[PDB]
Subunit: 251 residues, 6 copies
């Protein structure tokens, strides 16, 4: 391998400069197979990598794992191999009662509730997406019949205390994060996830483009975690949107 974690060489990317970077190693193939000539490349730790072809052009699909530190490794190593563009697709808990299960969210920037973003810039630096790649995510939603939510996402180093979940062993949340969900709700913050702050801050500072789209799997104003009673029932998927965003950008 040319890179220390991902198990990839530059040859294997066949000149790809754009990656779709989902969180889950298990989504990668499905993503890859919505494009042409999907090929397995590597699987090491949380990092499963496919190649596919969007309208004749090469696209790397590589999982990040949960949260910024695993993300930072993927993003650096892909960029060592010549990726300059990172499209995150993921699931997300809505914190606004008007943001329904199954809606799609385009994250334009992030509340920095991570530590990895600080390894790229002081906290004063905005965790902001690429304008042009956000534009293409928004457009790919609208083509899909979907007006996405566009705004600010709380990006958290934890799924439990940092997203003010109490259904936990101690059911205690440290002072900094006690009340914090209402703080972000009051500020019009749409959702929680766990990687966008890091991906954005490292992309913006290192001169790479990033954006993030995500399907809503629960509303935190009604359930801490989704269960069978939560609406699954499909519609227009964040995975189809990110692929068509990828085509917009390479075309």
């Amino acid at each position: 391998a040319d890179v220390f974690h991902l198990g990839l060489t530059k040859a294997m990317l066949d000149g790809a400069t754009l990656a779709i970077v989902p969180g889950d190693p298990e989504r990668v193939k499905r993503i890859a197979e919505l494009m042409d000539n999907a090929t397995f490349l590597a699987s090491h730790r949380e990092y499963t990598s496919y190649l596919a072809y969007a309208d004749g052009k090469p696209v790397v699909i590589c999982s990040t794992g949960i949260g910024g530190p695993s993300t930072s490794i993927a993003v650096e190593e892909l960029a060592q191999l010549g990726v300059n563009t990172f499209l995150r697709v993921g699931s997300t808990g809505a914190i606004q009662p008007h943001v329904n299960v199954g809606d799609v969210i385009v994250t334009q920037a992030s509340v920095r509730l991570d530590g990895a973003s600080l390894h790229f810039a002081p906290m004063e630096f905005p965790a902001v997406a690429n304008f042009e790649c956000t534009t293409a995510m928004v457009a790919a939603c609208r083509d899909a019949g979907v007006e996405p939510h566009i705004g600010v996402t709380a990006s958290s180093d934890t799924f439990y205390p940092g997203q003010e979940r109490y259904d936990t062993v101690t059911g205690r949340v440290t002072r900094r994060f006690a009340g914090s969900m209402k703080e972000w709700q009051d500020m019009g913050v749409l959702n929680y996830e766990m990687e966008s702050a890091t991906l954005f801050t490292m992309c913006a500072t290192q001169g790479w483009r990033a954006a993030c789209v995500a399907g809503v799997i629960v509303n935190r104003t009604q359930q801490e975690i989704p269960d069978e009673a939560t609406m699954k029932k499909t519609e227009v998927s964040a995975v189809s949107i990110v692929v068509a965003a990828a085509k917009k950008l390479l075309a």
Copy 2:
């Protein structure tokens, strides 16, 4: 007046929900007169307001003065009168050597080198512009034959040390800002101005839309202060028309 600083009532706005907010009280009238039926409203302290119409739609033009505290009172008090959109226009120092003087910058989000931003959100919250108004600025540039620089601006509570200016009485920059320019340069930050961090944080947190377009009057890789020698103000009026359509 129905507000504590600006000398305005809501009636005076004729139903305007959108403000063009430049810095100089001496630039309000001129911007306004790019519109129709430019109307004096009020001049108090650094707050000169005009009402004008943009293809039939009422627009406040209100100066903010320099720096986020003065901006925060203009933006709060205007909102208390129905404004829900704040389009910032002005001038800037470019800190990238590919941003030429007379370039246009559209500011997506800002480094928070201010204090007023912290009176609305903790520093972890991004100082981010409204996507729709930003999209409207970008389009107005392209209608005028201008491809703007789109990215990150350093928004500083000072003109001198915070923007890493040495041509001062003491010629010292406190540690925290010593080498700060380069840091921002290396980060791909385009420019310095003194309000967008406040404007963007307070609007984002308070459910109002904001955006920022600015013309480049010095390049900081060359010199600290501009030589003593229209497009941005043309674009912001263009954008205001798009958003009120």
Copy 3:
């Protein structure tokens, strides 16, 4: 001009080394007419400059605008022109029940609720007024038959949430300023204003003198000329 914002030359000030720095442009002229030979200098953005003469010596009267950013520009640009002394006057409310409308506050030092002070020193540095100019401000109060409240002022980057005002569109105050009025009240903080922290920190660190007198015109918990009258006597005290 010699300076980027204020539109002044070093010549225009006739060797003046002391400024009277109020916030409001529309107050400059009439502060300057309390002295001899009051002359319009420049008017740019929120910066309206006047010269006049205290017992034969020139004093510059220059407005700052609201808040430490616009203050920071005025103070730096005046200093580029040989000003070494910055007397702030103004009006304020108070957050203590014993501070009645009509009272004067001399601010000895300030809570740093601003950003621009951090552009001159880390937060550990005290936002402290010059002992000499503060003493002059006090003696002028007392000369006028006023015993001023001498204490700590909360200097806020904002009029509204930083001063824990809920009379706003959203009626929301961010967590760090939720409760913050009772905290300052309890620590004996006399009032809020929006400039003294930047002015203080910037003059201390750059080696200039500053002070801040202010008449009380409102008390949240429950004279304009006096405070201008007092600052002008302070200036003569210092230039005598």
Copy 4:
């Protein structure tokens, strides 16, 4: 499942109250297979879980993925299922010139260069390991003819800038992390890894025991990254952590 990520139920753990929590899902089965009756429990995302028996005592083996956020999920979710004790085994880079490739380190506490530890306690709280499980870690080294290094570990959210690696696309480290290796050096900080700060802080605060043993793969005084020239043949930190697990469950 009764936890949201791991795919586990309590019964699946057979009363296990102790996990070995490596980073790598690829390695969970091998670690398991150093115990008895290795049993596949779940695989979801970076989270591969096995049960096995440590001299008749049930042990869960669960991968954390890299860094504190993924670790935090695993530890919360195991602890809903009755785990009260978390032994971290893994690899590390040495930042002291006397700490040789192949030595073992038992981390008694960590520099909190992470964000997830702040989701459990303010920065003033120490990221300290449990005294008992650290002692067991040291006893299981010495049982194996190994004197481990025992001290403070720099626990970093990033592999690259936060460990002051410059062999990167930009070759730039942000001002906070610039010179930071020298700083931890001078402080007698022994090594870099990416999870112990989160784990220690979430465990000490939530009332759960934790410790962490790790084998040195590179010395940062000589190479950013281990390569073929780096030393290949010694007591494994996996052998140590299984040994400690028996002692603690004895």
Copy 5:
């Protein structure tokens, strides 16, 4: 004892509302003997307490120990027995070339390089002396024909690294304090000592007056002064109790 550390009772103070609070226990008795009818009160840990009379008014002389935390106990427990004014006297070195050995410093406010200050107010709060006590101090200097340096003091939790000293075992200064002296020197900071930040903030926040004079016995950049400083502070006490 009404108070757990100092071993004192309100009755023992005879209505004293003012304390001279020097750092060194061994100095207390002597400070006290500039005054009338000097009377041992208590000695526990680093806290030696005396009562003397300054122009017939009760004055407490109580040692604090070195640094903010020991200072914070003496100040709180004294205040519990009705003390409302605290005059600190000391010697100091000085970090400005224009400050000569034998000069006097009157600290008007202090850089907060302490932790105890933060146990009373966030860092934004200024570590400012009381204006009236400072004035008293300035005027007692002047009455002794001494023109004091009136400025900002760097109040450090440590004698060595927080004062950017390299003459230590390791010779190492942690990044925060690397270059820190030059920074304060540049900002006009006159000196380092180890308590004024704690004393100032706790007194400002709690509603008690404080002030600080100190003779300059050394200057990094380069008895009589100690007798001067303790003489000055006693003079200042009388000014305030008049």
Copy 6:
């Protein structure tokens, strides 16, 4: 002297490389007399030093005064005189209700409510005790038939507000320390004292060994002020194990 505060020369220590550092200058002679041939060295400010012999090896017994600034001077100046090991002994107030007044606490590490720590390392650095000296204090408890509480201590710059005491002149604690005792409680913090964060950070960083044992004189679940020894005999016993 060879040092700036303590009044000690290297010669006076007789090759002692280990100090016992209690807080109270009045506790020093007493500790020293638990060893052989106890010798007054000096007394300066809050710094009273004795020498004694522990199974034939020199041990310095040096008070630190209250709180990290004074501890930092005494620790630095001892180390200038060849001291590499500092065993701290003292009193403590327990915040967990399962800790009995009269119990022993062995502080593995400290919450840094103290400023002197920051003069040695950033707050991110853990205020961790030395493994071996902590190990030694645990074994010296158990040899004495006492199972000590082992974990985390809240090491505060103040006795009053930093320990969230309200029986004060103002009866007010600043926002950062309001509700803080409950927070430390919920996190399993054992006790409050005022030196261990400075001691541990400064030893850790400077390559010296440090540990702490202390006897519980008040339970803060009951009251704020203690009502009117094993930990001192445990510390002498830990010293002999480490010098053996």
